[PDB]
Structure 1
Amino acid sequence: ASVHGTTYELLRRQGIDTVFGNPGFNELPFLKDFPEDFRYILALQEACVVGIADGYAQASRKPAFINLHSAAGTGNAMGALSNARTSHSPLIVTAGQQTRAMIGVEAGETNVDAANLPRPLVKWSYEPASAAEVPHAMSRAIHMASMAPQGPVYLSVPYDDWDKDADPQSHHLFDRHVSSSVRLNDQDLDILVKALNSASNPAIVLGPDVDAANANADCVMLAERLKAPVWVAPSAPRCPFPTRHPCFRGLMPAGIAAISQLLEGHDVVLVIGAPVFRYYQYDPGQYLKPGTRLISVTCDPLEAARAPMGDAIVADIGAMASALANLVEESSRQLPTAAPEPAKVDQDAGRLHPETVFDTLNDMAPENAIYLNESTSTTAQMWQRLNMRNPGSYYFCAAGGLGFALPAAIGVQLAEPERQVIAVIGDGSANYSISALWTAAQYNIPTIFVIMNNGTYGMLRQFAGLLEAENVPGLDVPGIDFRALAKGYGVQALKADNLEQLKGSLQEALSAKGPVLIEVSTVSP
């Protein structure tokens, strides 16, 4: 049968038909004789490779298979893998390794200490000891990434292994299925349910793993029965709730003191699918005001152990959310009032304000559109001004790693052809993963790229305001032509220097059959 044939049989039997890669010499014996039932998505830089696969996996809610070249190709993808760890993203990262006979010699393209290079961003890293073990190793790689908490995994395979004969017992791997859909036992669950019904002013914090689980609808019901406000946890990688539902309270501030003040007055605070408050800024204070008890449901033991406060349960987010929403009694309390409609900012005929750009997206864009965010100074306004009523409608780099949104948008749009993907990316952020645009052109993935050009790293200048950071170099990015960049990679390029220009550009981009980039002149932060 051979390792090559057996592995490709194992991948299809495990449901994988797509390979996101940038080719290399160690990868040719694996890439050769490519099965007709598989499809290869090529990106020009390995950060783009993983980013595309990442968005594809997050929207599909299935594993994604990557093929990179040795250490150099693995190294270029490490920033993406960092984002891919904090988003519990099921990624099977494979890298070709030199012939076993020359690894000790360290011949050119040898990945030295290969399993250590991904760490500590990968749940599992491995280099098989024997060619016939490779399929088994791939099997571990798939399940490791698939099993909760979902995470990136790494497998280095010497290129001489693919032609060798596979183990005849490797066929037992093909139909292996491991379940993680677990929930709290009835006795402890009923205790929790009794505490939610007893709470006089409960509150719900929802994290990215809620959207990863597609537990949004269950979380809506739970919020309705509890008649409880709902916040999305800070540094949110995803949107787990309808942003215009009367219970939704918006994006929590990323500060210790600021979160405990918001939570003050709620006896029970139920967190689901979220790390227990990840803070960006140092806002020292009380983690919790007195009279507030916190219960956290998480798929990740690291999150449960990490918490500075509260109880925690390590279970499946989907199974827990569905159990809690169907078990709780409907509260007599009145439903919370929907947050106020956002105000319209003054907009002259000149450079566009971010608020105006987000309002124009909301009226113009489809109700089932998918948004992506790498405009770091405008996140607060984007959450307020974009009505996202459906799951899988928002993605933001989980670890804050720039270069995610542009390639990921191509991956999401590939995963969801029926939904229109609009990526709002700031200037400067677009540079990290710029080559990915080519993949959208070559495969005609019709992602819309909206570039917010202010000529600066807006968030960095704003933050340098918090604290007296004066005379900080490297904060301005003047003189980039994004329409020229989009042409270089074959993406149709549009511009928008005013509102009417923006309105027209958007209507055109929505009608386009190919990818489109719109460079937007925006006002400085």
Structure 2
Amino acid sequence: DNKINIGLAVMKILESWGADTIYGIPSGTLSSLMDAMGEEENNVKFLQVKHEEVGAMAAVMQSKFGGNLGVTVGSGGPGASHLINGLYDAAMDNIPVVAILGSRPQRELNMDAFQELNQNPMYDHIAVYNRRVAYAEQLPKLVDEAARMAIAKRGVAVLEVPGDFAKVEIDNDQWYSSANSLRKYAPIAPAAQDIDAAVELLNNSKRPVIYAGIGTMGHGPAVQELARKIKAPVITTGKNFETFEWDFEALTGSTYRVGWKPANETILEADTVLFAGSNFPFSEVEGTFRNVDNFIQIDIDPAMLGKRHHADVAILGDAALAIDEILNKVDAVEESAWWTANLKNIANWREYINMLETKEEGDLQFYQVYNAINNHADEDAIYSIDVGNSTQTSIRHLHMTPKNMWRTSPLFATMGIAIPGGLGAKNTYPDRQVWNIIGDGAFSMTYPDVVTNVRYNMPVINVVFSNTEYAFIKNKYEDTNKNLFGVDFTDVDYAKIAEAQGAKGFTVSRIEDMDRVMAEAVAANKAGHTVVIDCKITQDRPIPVETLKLDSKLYSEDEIKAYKERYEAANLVPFREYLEAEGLESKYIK
């Protein structure tokens, strides 16, 4: 032992917690810390972005993709405030992340000096830890605690660090890392009494349905086995599609807008719901469970029990263990009209989606772009999805399995999350295929950072949907609005921009050219190039499954006619028809 630079102690602590990547932009108020990076064999690396928000989002998405604890830095003032969208996303998603806000040196604090201000209020509302380092010697301790807190509290830990502190020297025995003491609780078994109560309700239900959220991640096979055992269809959430085999016979999709027709119809006809590992945000406001008779919930967070609906049975514990216990105790069901009707309803929907995906010629639609992705993507591909309409609808098309990872900004829903997501993913899995699926609006908020993928040799495939409008937005106007006004724009050449950035650009606007273009894009990505595919698509909007104008007892002949014509849905059949075909009756229609 002897003496050590404070900045270096900080880097040693970060490395001990596995936080080997710092995202951000170099600046005077952060230079002392960054100067310590490297040296004494430290392996903490710096990934420089073009906009600090991309750095924050990348640090966060890194964890969402199963990577190490991310660290993002923002220079005093504007750099720090630029981290906001990334930090809010992490806070709402409960993702651990350490944010270091640089600051003018201690002597300048409170003097109303240049770019000097109190940054403590900035993130106090969303952070699990938010402190302004009071003196140099305690910086190591606070960085260590920030990492410990970010992880233990599953959130944003923020430290404001005067720029002169990291230069200070201390005795090597005046700092330590608590990373070695990191402990996490292993899956906890559920109460038998609660499992038994659930089993009884499921055994006696005439129309059971499993509604699985990410709490079931890693246990899709078990959930599918249970679905088959008791003949209960499966509904998933917009965040949990990868948990199931895309072609599972009883997968109805998700409910509400970013969902499928089957799930939306199933939930309104269901009797008993097994709500496993979910905190579905549309539950109350969209009346998702308005027709259900019994509600069983499984969750590891007591705060979630009975939150989205009254729970007749509450099971506290790991969804895996709970599903396993339920699967083992429930009675097998050989035949079920409810199940048969649902399987046909799902098949009908798949026929529709397949027809759209496999068109041979004409103006390119996003349906065929997704078709090309399915035909060229690796089986373990990673998908970083932005928040637009054309991108969220990817869950209706991508043929995923648990070998894939699909992540976005699902609750805060910040636009521009795709590119940073790709950075975090590629940083964690350098030899894995990474796709960033982005709408033009979201791309326009972050494309300058495409150069970051180029510069750091982290090749990704950017699929950009261009249609001179914010689809989702403009698409909703036609409903909640009796007008429209402003929502379109010129046609920027994204392929050319990509080339100017050192990336490879492609442009496609026809269905018959899509396969070849995707093939070339993928081959280029395998040659180590970051690619941008500018997909000039139509103004077509994904069919609104939250408002299915198909049942003749819910809508007029004219409405159904127009609905079918607009969405090329002539062959879609209302669920009630399939129910009646199996001898059942709708529980709410008529």
TM-score of the alignment, normalized to the shorter chain, above 0.5: yes
2:160 is aligned to 156
Verify: 1:49 aligned to 2:52, yes or no.
Answer: no
1:325 is aligned to 324
2:123 is aligned to 118
Given candidates 141, 145, 170, the residue that maps to 1:140 is 145
1:11 is aligned to 14
Please state how far the C-alpha of 1:224 moved relative to its aligned partner. Answer: 4.8
Please state how far the C-alpha of 1:12 moved relative to its aligned partner. Answer: 1.5
Amino acid at match of 2:278: A
Alignment of 1:355-434 (within 5 A): 355-374=367-386, 376-379=388-391, 381-398=393-410, 399-434=412-447
Alpha carbons of structure 1 residues 278 and 106: separation in structure 2 relative to 1, 3 Å: farther
What are the Cα deviations for residues 97-118 of structure 1, in whole angstroms up to 9, with x where unaligned? 2222211213223241x23202
CA distance in 1, matches of 2:460, 2:405: 14
CA distance in 1, matches of 2:474, 2:405: 29
Please state how far the C-alpha of 1:487 moved relative to its aligned partner. Answer: 2.2
Verify: 1:288 aligned to 2:290, yes or no.
Answer: yes
1:39 is aligned to 45
1:507 is aligned to 519
Bigger relative contact order, structure 1 or 2 (CA pairs below 8 A, ≥6 apart)? 1
Alpha carbons of structure 1 residues 260 and 220: separation in structure 2 relative to 1, 3 Å: closer
SS of 1:435's partner is helix
Contact 2:110 2:117 in 1 (8 A): no
How many residues of Structure 1 are paired with residues of Structure 2 in the alignment?
Answer: 512
2:108 is aligned to 102
What are the Cα deviations for residues 101-160 of structure 1, in whole angstroms up to 9, with x where unaligned? 211213223241x23202433333222333222222222221222125x22221111222
Alpha carbons of structure 1 residues 305 and 180: separation in structure 2 relative to 1, 3 Å: farther
Amino acid at match of 1:28: S
Verify: 1:20 aligned to 2:23, yes or no.
Answer: yes
Verify: 1:249 aligned to 2:262, yes or no.
Answer: no
Contact 2:208 2:273 in 1 (8 A): yes
TM-score (norm 2): 0.78
Please state how far the C-alpha of 1:385 moved relative to its aligned partner. Answer: 1.8
What are the Cα deviations for residues 337-366 of structure 1, in whole angstroms up to 9, with x where unaligned? 483233313857442011111122212222
Alpha carbons of structure 1 residues 176 and 265: separation in structure 2 relative to 1, 3 Å: same
CA distance in 1, matches of 2:127, 2:312: 27
1:445 is aligned to 458
Please state how far the C-alpha of 1:522 moved relative to its aligned partner. Answer: 0.3
Contact 2:234 2:252 in 1 (8 A): yes
Verify: 1:263 aligned to 2:274, yes or no.
Answer: no
Please state how far the C-alpha of 1:275 moved relative to its aligned partner. Answer: 1.5
What are the Cα deviations for residues 240-267 of structure 1, in whole angstroms up to 9, with x where unaligned? 3332222322121159xx9896434544
1:297 is aligned to 299
Please state how far the C-alpha of 1:458 moved relative to its aligned partner. Answer: 0.7
Contact 1:48 1:435 in 2 (8 A): no
Alpha carbons of structure 1 residues 515 and 124: separation in structure 2 relative to 1, 3 Å: same
Please state how far the C-alpha of 1:465 moved relative to its aligned partner. Answer: 1.1
What are the Cα deviations for residues 48-72 of structure 1, in whole angstroms up to 9, with x where unaligned? 1122222222112432111221231
Amino acid at match of 1:146: I
CA distance in 1, matches of 2:225, 2:365: 36
1:344 is aligned to 355
CA distance in 1, matches of 2:265, 2:440: 35
CA distance in 2, matches of 1:307, 1:26: 45
Verify: 1:277 aligned to 2:278, yes or no.
Answer: no
CA distance in 2, matches of 1:291, 1:178: 41
Amino acid at match of 2:156: P
User: Identity, % of aligned pairs?
Assistant: 17
Please state how far the C-alpha of 1:31 moved relative to its aligned partner. Answer: 0.3
Verify: 1:228 aligned to 2:241, yes or no.
Answer: no
Query: Which residues of structure 1 form unaligned runs of 5+?
Result: none
Amino acid at match of 1:177: L
CA distance in 2, matches of 1:116, 1:122: 10
What are the Cα deviations for residues 366-406 of structure 1, in whole angstroms up to 9, with x where unaligned? 22222233262335752222110125421222222111012
Given candidates 60, 75, 85, the residue that maps to 2:81 is 75
Please state how far the C-alpha of 1:481 moved relative to its aligned partner. Answer: 1.5
Contact 2:241 2:395 in 1 (8 A): no
Contact 1:304 1:312 in 2 (8 A): no
2:566 is aligned to none
CA distance in 1, matches of 2:313, 2:51: 40
Backbone CA RMSD of aligned residues: 3.1
CA distance in 1, matches of 2:175, 2:268: 56
Amino acid at match of 1:320: A
Please state how far the C-alpha of 1:324 moved relative to its aligned partner. Answer: 3.0
Please state how far the C-alpha of 1:462 moved relative to its aligned partner. Answer: 0.8
Contact 1:495 1:502 in 2 (8 A): no
Alpha carbons of structure 1 residues 485 and 332: separation in structure 2 relative to 1, 3 Å: same
Deviates more, 1:329-338 or 1:453-462: 329-338
Alignment of 1:204-215 (within 5 A): 204-211=210-217, 214-215=218-219
What are the Cα deviations for residues 430-477 of structure 1, in whole angstroms up to 9, with x where unaligned? 01111220111001211101111111111111100112341432x002
CA distance in 2, matches of 1:377, 1:414: 27
CA distance in 1, matches of 2:323, 2:253: 22
CA distance in 2, matches of 1:299, 1:436: 37
Contact 1:136 1:173 in 2 (8 A): no
Please state how far the C-alpha of 1:45 moved relative to its aligned partner. Answer: 0.1
Alpha carbons of structure 1 residues 524 and 190: separation in structure 2 relative to 1, 3 Å: closer
Query: Which residues of structure 2 form unaligned runs of 5+?
Result: 541-590
Alpha carbons of structure 1 residues 70 and 508: separation in structure 2 relative to 1, 3 Å: same
CA distance in 2, matches of 1:242, 1:504: 27
Alpha carbons of structure 1 residues 493 and 250: separation in structure 2 relative to 1, 3 Å: same
Larger Rg: 2
